[PDB]
């Protein structure tokens, strides 16, 4: 009797991820009291209006 095995495994798990997140905005105001100008022109991201 005689016997012989050859056995092989090869595995490749590549992966990747990316994310680009960009936000911009520019309130602009003319007229009105400078305190109300600054208080409104500051961009509230939850209410850009």
């Amino acid at each position: 009797s005689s016997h012989g095995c050859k056995e092989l495994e090869n595995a490749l798990k590549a992966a990747s991820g990316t994310q680009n997140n960009v936000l911009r905005g520019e309130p602009f105001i003319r007229g009105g009291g400078a305190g109300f100008i600054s208080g409104l022109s500051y961009l509230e991201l939850d209410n850009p209006a």
């Binding site: 056995e7 495994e9 590549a14 990747s16 997140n21 007229g31 400078a34 100008i37 500051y42």
Partner: protein, 50 residues
């Protein structure tokens, strides 16, 4: 001399003689920019022989 009426809101001001205008030209400009970037890379390799 002076003593021309000059107002801002309810307050009245005496303009200096040297000054041609001091006037509440009121304006505001805001700028917001936000740039978030992510990348990641993963590489697993296995080799087995028997």
């Amino acid at each position: 001399g002076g003593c021309s009426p000059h107002y801002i809101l309810n307050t009245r001001f005496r303009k200096p003689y040297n000054v041609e205008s001091y006037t509440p030209q009121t304006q505001g400009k805001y700028e917001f920019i936000l740039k978030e970037y992510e990348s990641y890379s993963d590489f697993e390799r296995n080799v087995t022989e028997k």
